[PDB]
């Protein structure tokens, strides 16, 4: 039914949005509280995580790029790349990484994962130019422009980002057949998150 | 009004000194041993008039248009410029 119980989703704060809203995000929004804060629907998150796990398992592993400027997302993307074999770029994204072949670390992926369209704007801009599919994590305040596959979640919290990337890595492993069952994946969620 | 005035049968170039046109016309003048430019221009005009009649007859319809259409083809094959089975295009 669910990849994890809804209690863990709620305790990790996946459903907590922001005081701002956007017209194209309303298909994912569940309700608004009395203090003006918008809440996300968690069943949609589970469905999109399953679909995203199926989509990403079909690409060649070293052709996947994951990025995260925001500090609370840096350890999760590094751990995701270590587990799945995907390239991972935490911190400042050097302009021209995907458009300037003369640069030392020039790299053209086949698919890109964006932690936040607002903060990772340089990576998204360069990815539009080279015509690859874009997968993104979207909060209540984000727009859906140039997003080809959207995953609705809180993308600012430490525990939520840890949980999202942990689930996504497990789904990829299960879908490509490197683990024969879900129970086999014995890597705790706490290893994806930043400490202190 | 004004009575009739007899008009030139040939047209002059819109600009006297264009390099490409000068080269092309010099080649023609040398090859066919024509006496002056106007002689060449005369023949050019004849060609233009033929094309202008075909362009007008393609976009026409009715009874006089057909008669004119067949007269143009007949005259062109009498002069030997088209074979016996040619069409308007």
């Amino acid at each position: 039914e669910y990849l994890v119980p809804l209690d863990q989703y709620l305790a990790a704060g996946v459903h907590i949005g922001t005081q701002q809203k956007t017209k194209d995000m309303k298909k994912f929004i569940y309700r608004v509280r009395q203090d003006g804060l918008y809440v996300l629907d968690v069943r949609k998150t589970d469905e999109r995580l399953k679909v995203a796990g199926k989509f990403l398992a079909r690409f060649d592993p070293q052709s996947i790029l994951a990025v995260s400027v925001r500090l609370y997302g840096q350890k999760p993307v590094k751990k995701f790349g270590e587990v799945t074999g995907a390239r991972a770029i935490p911190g400042r994204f050097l302009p021209g990484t995907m458009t300037n072949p003369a640069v030392k670390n020039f790299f053209e992926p086949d698919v890109i994962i964006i932690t936040d369209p607002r903060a990772d704007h340089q990576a998204m801009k360069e990815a539009i130019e080279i015509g690859i599919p874009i997968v993104a994590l979207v909060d209540t305040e984000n727009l859906l422009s140039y997003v080809d596959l959207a995953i609705p979640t809180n993308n600012k919290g430490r525990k939520a980002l840890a949980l999202i990337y942990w689930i996504l890595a497990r789904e990829i492993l299960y879908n490509r057949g490197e683990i024969s069952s879900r129970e086999e994946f014995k890597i705790p969620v706490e290893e994806f998150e930043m400490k202190i | 009004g004004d009575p009739k005035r007899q008009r030139k049968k040939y047209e002059t170039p819109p600009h006297p000194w264009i390099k490409e046109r000068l080269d092309r016309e010099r080649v023609l003048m040398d090859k066919y041993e024509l006496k002056n430019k106007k002689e060449l221009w005369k023949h050019e005009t004849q060609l233009k008039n033929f094309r202008r009649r075909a362009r007008r007859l393609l976009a026409a319809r009715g009874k006089q248009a057909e008669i004119e259409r067949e007269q143009l083809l007949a005259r062109l094959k009498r002069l030997g410029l088209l074979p016996e089975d040619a069409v308007l295009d």
Binding site: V51, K54, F55, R58, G131, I134, L144, D148 | -
Partner: protein
């Protein structure tokens, strides 16, 4: 023979030579190819797989 010009899955217009379009296999089933033109991507138009019926960006 000649070649076929690709057509956007959402709106059905042809893809022009140098626009910022994209194409990918269906995320849900993987049996069909989705094309999205620059205008549909910019406005976040929804799309629907012609085989399994899963819809949306």
């Amino acid at each position: 023979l000649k070649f076929e010009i690709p057509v956007c899955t959402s709106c059905g217009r042809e893809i022009t030579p140098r626009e910022h379009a994209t194409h990918f296999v269906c995320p849900n089933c993987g049996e069909a190819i989705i094309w999205r033109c620059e205008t549909c991507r910019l406005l976040a138009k929804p799309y629907k797989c012609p085989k399994c019926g899963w819809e949306g960006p």
